[PDB]
Amino acid sequence: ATNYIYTPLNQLKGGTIVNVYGVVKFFKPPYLSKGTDYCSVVTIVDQTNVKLTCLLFSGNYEALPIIY
DNA sequence: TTAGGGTTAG
């Protein structure tokens, strides 16, 4: 069954595959990086004010999460 | 792989 243990973002260590929640404190719209994939940058914050950065890579915009 | 948020001088 579907499950998610939302936990303060600081606990999300490298190599871990996680299910999370947060407000977007800052983000860049999808832009083409040196690589082949457009990179969208997102800074997210949870209810405990803890932060996480996300780099969302895709060859196009539509494949990425929808944020405005 | 890249990038991995913060002012151009147009």
Distance of CA A21 to the CA centre of its chain: 9
Strand B bases within 7 angstroms of protein beta carbons: 1-5
A43 CB neighbours strand B below 7 A:
yes
A51 CB neighbours strand B below 7 A:
no
Cα–Cα dist A24/A51, whole Å: 10
Cα–Cα dist A8/A42, whole Å: 17
Cα–Cα dist A58/A11, whole Å: 26
Residue whose pair of structure tokens reads 């969302």 in the numeric block:
A56
Buried b (16+ CB within 10 A) or exposed e, A32-49: eeeeebbbbebebebeee
Cα–Cα dist A61/A65, whole Å: 8
> Measured in angstroms, what separates residue A2's CA from nucleotide B7's C1'?
43
Cα–Cα dist A16/A47, whole Å: 21
Resolution in angstrom units: 4.1
Nucleotide B6: closest residue by CA–C1': A26
